[PDB]
Structures are given as C-alpha cells and as structure tokens.
Amino acid sequence: HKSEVAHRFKDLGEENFKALVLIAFAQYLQQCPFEDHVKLVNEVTEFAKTCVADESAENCDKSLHTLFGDKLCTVATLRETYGEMADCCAKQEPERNECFLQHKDDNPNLPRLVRPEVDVMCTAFHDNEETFLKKYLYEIARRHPYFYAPELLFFAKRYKAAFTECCQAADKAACLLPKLDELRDEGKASSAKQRLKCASLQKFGERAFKAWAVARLSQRFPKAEFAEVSKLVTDLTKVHTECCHGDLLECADDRADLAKYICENQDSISSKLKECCEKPLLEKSHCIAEVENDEMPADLPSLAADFVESKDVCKNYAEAKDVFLGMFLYEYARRHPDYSVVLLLRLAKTYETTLEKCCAAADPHECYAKVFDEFKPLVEEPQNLIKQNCELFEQLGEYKFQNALLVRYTKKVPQVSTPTLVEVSRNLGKVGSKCCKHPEAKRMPCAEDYLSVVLNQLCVLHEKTPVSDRVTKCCTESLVNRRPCFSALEVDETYVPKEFNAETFTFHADICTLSEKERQIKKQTALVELVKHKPKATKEQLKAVMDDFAAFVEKCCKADDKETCFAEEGKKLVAASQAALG
Ligand SMILES: O=C(CCCCC(=O)Nc1c(I)cc(I)c(C(=O)O)c1I)Nc1c(I)cc(I)c(C(=O)O)c1I
Ligand SMILES: CCCCCCCCCCCCCC(=O)O
Ligand SMILES: CCCCCCCCCCCCCC(=O)O
Ligand SMILES: CCCCCCCCCCCCCC(=O)O
Structure with missing residues (x-):
C-alpha cells in the first residue's frame, strides 16, 4: 500500500524477511564480515516492524531500492574496502542502484569453503541452529552474488532438514555426507543453469529464447491454447531478461506477478498446478517452474493437416513467419513430452528451411510434401544414443561405464587435460546412472537437462585454456548443433x-x-x-x-x-x- 517494507514484511514473514535481507546484503557487500551483516539485518528488521505498526512512520514511504541503497551507503569502510562502489553513493536513484549492479563481482577471490567434520557440524548445529545456518547462508551468498535469493533460501531449508534428521542418527556420517554431497551437486547444477540461460539470452538472442520457451511451455501445458502460451512466453522472456540483469527486486516482482497470473488462469493452462497455487508467495514460482507435465488431450489431430496436407500453408507462413513456426513448435512439442527441447528446435529449424526453399517454388504443396520424412532421422539419432548408452550402462556399472567413456573421449580429443577428461567422463557417467533408470518416454528430456550443464561447463574450461579447434567449433556452434557436434567427433x-x-x-x-x-x-x-x-x-x-x-x-x-x-x-x-x- 503506502509502505513497501511493511508490505513485504507482512506477506513474507519475519523469518523469511530476515534471511532474504541477509542474502541481499551479502551479495552486494561480499567483503564485510558476518557479524556486520547481522547488524544491518537487525536494523532493517527493526525498521520494518516500525512501518508494520504504522505505515506513516519516518521513511516508511520510501521505495525499497532507495532504502536499500541508503543503508548500503551507510557502511563507513565502503570506500576504503570497496573503493569505486562508494562513488555510487554520490549518484541518485536509479543510477545509484544501477551503479551497485555494475560493481558486483561474480567471482570474488574468496577461499574455497571447506566442509568440517560431521561432529563439529552437528555440534555447532545443536548449539546454535541460528548463527550456524545464517553464517553459512552468508558464505554461499557472497560467493554467488547472482543466485536468485529465494532459491538460495529454498536450499537452506533442505540443509537444515538434513542436519535435523542426521545429527540424531545412529550413524551421522552415513546419513549426512551423502545428503550434503547431493545438495552441493544440485546447488552447483542450479547455478550452472541460471548462468547458462542468461548467457544464451545474450549470444543467441531473443528469438531463439522465445523458441526454446514455446517448446518447453508446450510440453508442460499441452492443454493450453496457443494464445496463452504466447502470452506466457512473452512474460517469461521479460522475467529472465530482468532477472539476468541481476536486480533482485524487479526480478522477484516479475516472478510473483507471473505466478499470480498463472494461478488465476489455472484451469485454462494446466490441471497439475493445484498444489503449487495454494502454496505461499515465496514458493509459488519455485513450485510452478518445477511442475510435472500435464496430460495431453487424446482428441488431437494430425500435424500434417495444418502443416503439410493443407495448401494455403505458404500463405499462413508468409502472413507471419515466426508466429506460424511458433504454432508448429507448439503443436509438435505438446504431443512430444518425450522429446528434448533442442530436438524440437531442430525439427522446426528443418521445417523453416523447407518452407523457405519451397514457398518460392513452382508447386509448393509438393516441394515440401515429404518434410515429415526428414524428421525421422533427426528423432532417431538422439534415441539410439540413449539406447546404446543406457544398455552399456546397465551391463557395466556406473564406474566401469565411466571408464568406457574415459577411453572413448581421450581418443577423440587426446589434447584435453587429464583432469578435465576425468571430470567430464564422471559427470557424464552420472547422467547415465541418473537418467537411464527412467522409462524411455522420459529419458531424453532428462539427458538434455544434465548434458547442457556438463557441455557448458566443458566449454568454459576450454574457453579459458583452449586446446583444440574441434572442441572450440562445437563450443561456438549453435546450441542446437552443440551436442550433435560433440557426438560427431571422431578418433584423432x-x-x-x-x-x-x-x-x-x-x-x-x-x-x-x-x-x-x-x-x-x-x-x-x-x-x-x-x-x-x-x-x-x-x-x-x-x-x-x-x-x-x-x-x-x-x-x-x-x-x-x-x-x-x-x-x-x-x-x-x-x-x-x-x-x-x-
Ligand atoms: O534452463 C532452462 C529450464 C527451463 C524450465 C522451463 C521454465 O521456463 N519454467 C518456468 C516457468 I513454466 C515459470 C516460471 I515464473 C519460471 C521462473 O522461475 O522464472 C520458470 I524457470 N531453460 C532454457 C531456456 I527457457 C532457454 C534457453 I536459450 C536454454 C539454453 O541455454 O539452451 C535453456 I537450458
Ligand atoms: C531491502 C531489500 C528487501 C528484500 C526484499 C526481497 C523481496 C523478495 C520477495 C520474494 C517473492 C517470492 C516470489 C517468487 O519468486 O517465487
Ligand atoms: C511465438 C513466438 C515465436 C517463436 C519463434 C519461432 C521460430 C522457430 C525457430 C526454430 C528453432 C531455431 C532456433 C535457433 O535459431 O537456434
Ligand atoms: C604402460 C603401463 C600401463 C600400466 C598402468 C595401468 C593403469 C591402468 C588403470 C586401470 C584402471 C581400471 C579400473 C579398475 O581396475 O577398476
């Protein structure tokens, strides 16, 4: 209403508020000691409560950005410790906030965080759940200044759950260690993904991003009308652009607003958004993003009707190229939850090329008439790989399968570093043990998700210390030919x-x-x-x-x-x- 702080305080809750402010400050002031952030949190929480009690108390009307920057500019050693950042304080809003965004270091020179012994963890845990968790939440946040705060908070609660459960266990280590390793791996993946998606919106551009989303949104919400999916793709694109820019506030509101939009139109979108939509503000988005595919209608036509066997096709396409292609992706993706998003893009890309070099031909209807005949070999390649590799995986174990991969890729790029090969072959080996257990109809989407992370992780290390053109080729190719390019590599x-x-x-x-x-x-x-x-x-x-x-x-x-x-x-x-x- 009249007070922003008060509003956020009211619907977030004291506990969640206190944790978010902590993460927020730890992300901008990555160099201040833990005890210093705790003071700020308390001061801001105290302020908040004042506003809760009376939306008219001093400054309770100021905007969060303004309030946030003022306390930020309050820090005395700002200049001696952060230097240039202090000059932001001279600027006014919004240049001030923009200035703070530009000075956030994504890879600070902080020491690697070390995992102590279970006993010390569990003891520190029991003796002070509070500082134990906030202290670590602080350490993670200062190291990943771009990690979406709420998501970071989602992870904190699972760590807490692991300590609560395991620190009472008969065998602490055997209970905790695995949950902890699983946790950092997943956290690592979550981070790799967020960076990857932003990078993409940068290199490949908006069209390709919009395409990706149509494919994904359609697999998940196969019952939604195409206009709804376009609506969602537009808002989703604005959402990631802003969240990639790194401004937490703008990002969070776009996400909430989008979640509230979805939940209100729930019925005309999906039937599986039930649980997610009753959940509290903080979790809604998280939940929805992760929601399972709704079920596709059984009374669904044949794509060839509107896309092949129907004249007036080059006319619909010319009328509005991207929109027609969008309808294609939509129609194709919602009938194939089993295809990898990138596979879908390949097909549409193929269709596009056909329509381009066929609508400017004599008899259109028959120039492209056998297009669906070119999709089969596109679909099969991925499947046979999942086929050949999952069998080999079941034969050998995770480890022997890893060794197989080890020999295989060393021979393809013997120039790559030995430790890099070991890293790649093992994560790769994991994707196998993690996806091969799924039923085939779910395997491909699984691999895509894991491989994207692994392949980008692979490409960065190489970007820095390039050692082969072949790899650099695959790494700078289109993100539709990335994996096929690597799959192609032959022995050296x-x-x-x-x-x-x-x-x-x-x-x-x-x-x-x-x-x-x-x-x-x-x-x-x-x-x-x-x-x-x-x-x-x-x-x-x-x-x-x-x-x-x-x-x-x-x-x-x-x-x-x-x-x-x-x-x-x-x-x-x-x-x-x-x-x-x-
Ligand atoms: O990472 C993903 C996971 C997509 C999951 C599919 C997806 O968009 N879900 C989803 C939904 I419905 C609603 C919301 I509100 C939110 C959110 O929290 O902002 C999300 I996360 N998708 C993705 C996209 I979208 C575009 C490109 I380009 C690439 C690439 O790098 O190839 C990728 I790997
Ligand atoms: C002074 C800075 C205060 C920080 C307030 C951050 C507000 C975050 C709102 C969280 C919204 C959750 C919605 C979602 O993304 O699922
Ligand atoms: C409704 C939003 C329009 C969707 C855009 C349709 C364009 C399909 C492009 C085919 C996939 C190739 C993507 C790429 O450039 O790598
Ligand atoms: C030319 C001298 C080569 C001798 C060194 C042999 C080292 C090969 C490592 C074998 C790893 C197989 C893994 C396993 O046995 O579980």
Whole structure:
C-alpha cells in the first residue's frame, strides 16, 4: 500500500524477511564480515516492524531500492574496502542502484569453503541452529552474488532438514555426507543453469529464447491454447531478461506477478498446478517452474493437416513467419513430452528451411510434401544414443561405464587435460546412472537437462585454456548443433602419443588406504595417461591391461609388506604391459 517494507514484511514473514535481507546484503557487500551483516539485518528488521505498526512512520514511504541503497551507503569502510562502489553513493536513484549492479563481482577471490567434520557440524548445529545456518547462508551468498535469493533460501531449508534428521542418527556420517554431497551437486547444477540461460539470452538472442520457451511451455501445458502460451512466453522472456540483469527486486516482482497470473488462469493452462497455487508467495514460482507435465488431450489431430496436407500453408507462413513456426513448435512439442527441447528446435529449424526453399517454388504443396520424412532421422539419432548408452550402462556399472567413456573421449580429443577428461567422463557417467533408470518416454528430456550443464561447463574450461579447434567449433556452434557436434567427433588420427614416463605409472600402497571415490580417480587418471600413451590400443588389449592392474592392486594391498609388493609387481606390470601394447 503506502509502505513497501511493511508490505513485504507482512506477506513474507519475519523469518523469511530476515534471511532474504541477509542474502541481499551479502551479495552486494561480499567483503564485510558476518557479524556486520547481522547488524544491518537487525536494523532493517527493526525498521520494518516500525512501518508494520504504522505505515506513516519516518521513511516508511520510501521505495525499497532507495532504502536499500541508503543503508548500503551507510557502511563507513565502503570506500576504503570497496573503493569505486562508494562513488555510487554520490549518484541518485536509479543510477545509484544501477551503479551497485555494475560493481558486483561474480567471482570474488574468496577461499574455497571447506566442509568440517560431521561432529563439529552437528555440534555447532545443536548449539546454535541460528548463527550456524545464517553464517553459512552468508558464505554461499557472497560467493554467488547472482543466485536468485529465494532459491538460495529454498536450499537452506533442505540443509537444515538434513542436519535435523542426521545429527540424531545412529550413524551421522552415513546419513549426512551423502545428503550434503547431493545438495552441493544440485546447488552447483542450479547455478550452472541460471548462468547458462542468461548467457544464451545474450549470444543467441531473443528469438531463439522465445523458441526454446514455446517448446518447453508446450510440453508442460499441452492443454493450453496457443494464445496463452504466447502470452506466457512473452512474460517469461521479460522475467529472465530482468532477472539476468541481476536486480533482485524487479526480478522477484516479475516472478510473483507471473505466478499470480498463472494461478488465476489455472484451469485454462494446466490441471497439475493445484498444489503449487495454494502454496505461499515465496514458493509459488519455485513450485510452478518445477511442475510435472500435464496430460495431453487424446482428441488431437494430425500435424500434417495444418502443416503439410493443407495448401494455403505458404500463405499462413508468409502472413507471419515466426508466429506460424511458433504454432508448429507448439503443436509438435505438446504431443512430444518425450522429446528434448533442442530436438524440437531442430525439427522446426528443418521445417523453416523447407518452407523457405519451397514457398518460392513452382508447386509448393509438393516441394515440401515429404518434410515429415526428414524428421525421422533427426528423432532417431538422439534415441539410439540413449539406447546404446543406457544398455552399456546397465551391463557395466556406473564406474566401469565411466571408464568406457574415459577411453572413448581421450581418443577423440587426446589434447584435453587429464583432469578435465576425468571430470567430464564422471559427470557424464552420472547422467547415465541418473537418467537411464527412467522409462524411455522420459529419458531424453532428462539427458538434455544434465548434458547442457556438463557441455557448458566443458566449454568454459576450454574457453579459458583452449586446446583444440574441434572442441572450440562445437563450443561456438549453435546450441542446437552443440551436442550433435560433440557426438560427431571422431578418433584423432593426427594425434602424436606422449612419451613414456615411469612415474605416471608408478603406484604406492597409499592407494590402499584411500576411499573408493579416491582410488577411482587415481586409477582413472592412469587410464587416460595410458590411452594418451598408446592411443591405437584396443578395447581388447586395453581390457587385458586394465585386468592385470585390477589384480595388481588387490593383490598388493592384501599382501604382506604392501610397499615392496607394489614396487616389485609394479616393475613387472609396467614391463609386461608396455610389451603387449608394443
Ligand atoms: O534452463 C532452462 C529450464 C527451463 C524450465 C522451463 C521454465 O521456463 N519454467 C518456468 C516457468 I513454466 C515459470 C516460471 I515464473 C519460471 C521462473 O522461475 O522464472 C520458470 I524457470 N531453460 C532454457 C531456456 I527457457 C532457454 C534457453 I536459450 C536454454 C539454453 O541455454 O539452451 C535453456 I537450458
Ligand atoms: C531491502 C531489500 C528487501 C528484500 C526484499 C526481497 C523481496 C523478495 C520477495 C520474494 C517473492 C517470492 C516470489 C517468487 O519468486 O517465487
Ligand atoms: C511465438 C513466438 C515465436 C517463436 C519463434 C519461432 C521460430 C522457430 C525457430 C526454430 C528453432 C531455431 C532456433 C535457433 O535459431 O537456434
Ligand atoms: C604402460 C603401463 C600401463 C600400466 C598402468 C595401468 C593403469 C591402468 C588403470 C586401470 C584402471 C581400471 C579400473 C579398475 O581396475 O577398476
């Protein structure tokens, strides 16, 4: 109403408010100590309560941006600590807020956050749930100044849940560690995605983004009328543009407003937005974004009717090209929740090319008449890969499957770094263990989601330390040919194998006293180095060498005087092995 702070305070709640303000400040003032942010939070909360009691108390009428910047400019060491940022305080609103946005460092030089021992965690937890959680929430926020605050808050509650449950467990570690690893991985993925999507809106442009959304929104809301989907795609695009700019307030309101729009028109959009829409303000958006696909009508026509077998098609298309293509995507995507969004884009892209080089032809109706015939090989390629790879995954285990990938990609790009190969092959290996368990009708969307993260993660490391044109090609290609481009890569014939190095293939008993997740990376590192030394090896020659190594390990660990054993059988191993691989 007349007071913004009061309003947000009222419908967010004290607890949520206090946490958000914390994250908000930790994101702009990434260098101040924890205890300092706590003071600000208390001061702002105290102020808020004043306004709650009387929307007319001093300053309660000022806008959040104004209020936020004023307290921000309140910090004394602003200039001595942040320098340039202090000059923002000289500017007025909105240049002031704009100025603060431009000075937020997305990759501060903060030390890697370390995970202490479960016992200390659980103890610190029990002795002060409050500071324990706010302190960590502070550490995460200052490191990811662009992570959508509410989402960060969503994660905090799951961490709390993990401590509550596990710190009472008979075996704390076995209960907590896995939940924690799962949590940071998921958090990492959530972050990689947010950055990825913004980057995209930048490179590829708005049209491609609008396309992506139509495909996605249509799979999810197959019953919605096309005009509703267009309406939603427009608002969604404005929403991400603003949320990418990094301004929390504008971002949050666009998201809420959009959630309220959806919920009000719920029936004419989806039947599965029931739970999500009764939920509280804070969670609505989160919920909705994650909602399961509604069910598609059974009384659905044939695409060929309006898109192939109907003359007056080049006329509808010329009438409004993007809109017609949109209707195509809409019609195609809502009938295929099983297709990957990018697959859908490929088809539409194909259709588009056809209509372009066929509507300017003699007899249109038959120039393009067999278009749906070109979609089949587009659809099949992805499917057969999910087919071939999920089987191999079930045969071997997650680990042996990972090793397979390891050999496979080293031979494609032997120039890539050994640790980078190990990283990629394992996450990749994960996508397999995480998606292959799904029923085929859900597999492809699964892989797309995971692979996009992995492929962009792959492309960044390379962007910085480029090592191959082939990779750089796939990495700067269209995000529709990205994965196909990588899938295409062939063995590197040009490659000149690295020289030999005894050390690289020398092992000590220490590997016996390492975690399964440790020995692995050690064995896997040697594997790449192996393939990098003998690239013309065979899955047969290789499997034989890997096998002798298998024994070698167990044999030397489960044998008296480990150290010597290794150095003894090791000389033998390296010797017999170098021989087979001539
Ligand atoms: O990341 C995603 C996940 C899409 C999930 C589909 C989606 O948009 N859901 C959704 C909905 I309904 C409503 C709201 I309110 C919100 C939100 O919280 O803002 C969201 I998140 N989508 C995506 C998009 I949209 C465009 C491009 I270009 C790319 C690329 O980088 O290829 C990608 I990977
Ligand atoms: C002075 C700064 C105060 C910070 C207030 C942030 C308000 C966030 C509103 C949260 C809306 C949740 C809607 C959603 O995105 O799902
Ligand atoms: C209703 C909003 C208009 C939707 C835009 C339709 C254009 C379809 C483009 C086909 C996909 C190719 C995307 C790309 O440029 O990479
Ligand atoms: C040319 C000397 C090569 C000898 C070094 C062999 C190292 C290969 C690592 C084998 C990893 C297989 C993993 C496993 O056994 O579970």
